[PDB]
Amino acid sequence: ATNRDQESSGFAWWAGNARLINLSGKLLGAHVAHAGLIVFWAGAMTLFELAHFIPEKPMYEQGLILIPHIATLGWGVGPGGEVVDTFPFFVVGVVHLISSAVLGFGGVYHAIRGPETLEEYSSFFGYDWKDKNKMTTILGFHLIVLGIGALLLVAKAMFFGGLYDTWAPGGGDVRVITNPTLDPRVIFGYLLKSPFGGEGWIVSVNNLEDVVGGHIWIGLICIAGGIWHILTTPFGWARRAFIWSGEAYLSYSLGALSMMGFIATCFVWFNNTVYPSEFYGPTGPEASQAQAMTFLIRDQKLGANVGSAQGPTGLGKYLMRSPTGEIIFGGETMRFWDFRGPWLEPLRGPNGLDLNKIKNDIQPWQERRAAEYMTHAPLGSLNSVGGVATEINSVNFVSPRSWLATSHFVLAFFFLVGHLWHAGRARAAAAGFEKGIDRESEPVLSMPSLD
Amino acid sequence: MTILFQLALAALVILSFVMVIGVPVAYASPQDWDRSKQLIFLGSGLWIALVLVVGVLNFFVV
Amino acid sequence: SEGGRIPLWIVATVAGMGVIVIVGLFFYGAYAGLGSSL
Amino acid sequence: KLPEAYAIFDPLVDVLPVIPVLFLALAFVWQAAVGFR
């Protein structure tokens, strides 16, 4: 046993994986076995969801998060997002579960049987954390890999059946994307949009052309960057800017993943394009707007003039102006006027919600949709009692949007914490005081007093 | 084909359980590694085979 | 009689699994019978 | 539901997703076996 106790390794059991920092073979085992864990979960969870799945219920009434992901890719669904074939889900689940056996095999092998270090075994697979060129080379490999993934998404969208498009004319449906957005002004224009209300940065992407074109761009960017990094070594300014160690790179990746986590949280909370409400349930904004729509419809059926109806506050009971003048639903849902959804947009004119369209053009499918979303608002208790906190037991419901947003906020936050921990430790260790202050060389004792 | 399928799949599960315990124990056991490496090769090839068998027979039972 | 015969890691693993089982039962019970709201 | 041919495996499938957590727990059993050295 090499380095598998504290006396020899310097790391206690609870920091045990730090014993792996300089053992590239065992560390490879750790990584592959872990990827095994991830794929395993994807597969088993998919099979569980499918086994539990009732096709004539909406997915979001059934605690499903993975099947919605598969369905968004256009697999197993037709018009309106109705399930037409569960077999693609089965395939995805099974293939992941089987693949996990493979990753687990390689992982266990490398972790306990294979060579502890790879450097004497191979110069290509061996690495020194401090070897900047090897690091950028491996980074390059992984960038090419990711680029290939994004292009896999593009391939699915353009050549292998398309994607589920909630915005599809005449109603949501699977659609092949033939004209993806290549214009860099639009694509990176998303990247320069404000993250605040009515703009919402990349989370605002609202059509599949932009998504696919974006992934074309990202695929090419990632492959080009990978090649760049295989062919180059870090410039002087980068060399002088960073800490070059395993723990440092780890910290950088933790920071990045934290950022990505928060982005995913906002994505699943607000976006209804790559997270279709047919599969994930309505967004909070969607459901609030849907309530306003529902009662506007109800009361108008009863004879209300919803344009001229003055609420208790002086604001329109049903309809009012946004701060820039757009006609919007009134009451509290005033906050959500930036909401956009296929069921609401036909009522939208140049100046916002059109009163004549409201009076004359609201279709039964819109009433149905607004009622459905209003009554499947993403509110519910931890034990999955649906609705406001004061609602009685009856409905077993928590929106998938809530599960995914909450889970990913928690994960993103702890990963930010991990980022601070590991970046600070990498700094201290690189500078040589991660274990404490030298009693005979205490820096502050050589500093002048503050006063 | 349902007999072939349902038993090939039961055998896949059973073999999987066997591999799951057996492989790490083998990898970390000091003696009998020669016998183990060959048993693991055999088990692995058989596992892959059973996966493919279940996979094909799937379309004759669904 | 002799101290050490049954390894402590086994005692811990078994006791721990027992705790997981009983607590698990309590959570099952949260969804069934009294207190289940049904 | 799973395709009818697979229905007999429902209970196994019901259990599978929790298996990854067991690996974390396994890490402790292993550590217990080596006395958390």
Binding site: - | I21, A28 | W9, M17 | D10, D14, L22, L26, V34
Partner: peptide, 29 residues
């Protein structure tokens, strides 16, 4: 219900079994 508890019984025991078997045989834990 009996089948599910049997499955999680075998799967659940598998890990500690790996550890136990290796500890008994003085394996490379």
């Amino acid at each position: 219900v009996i089948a599910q508890l049997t499955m999680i019984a075998m799967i659940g025991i598998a890990g500690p079994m790996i550890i136990f078997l290796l500890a008994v045989r003085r394996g490379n834990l």
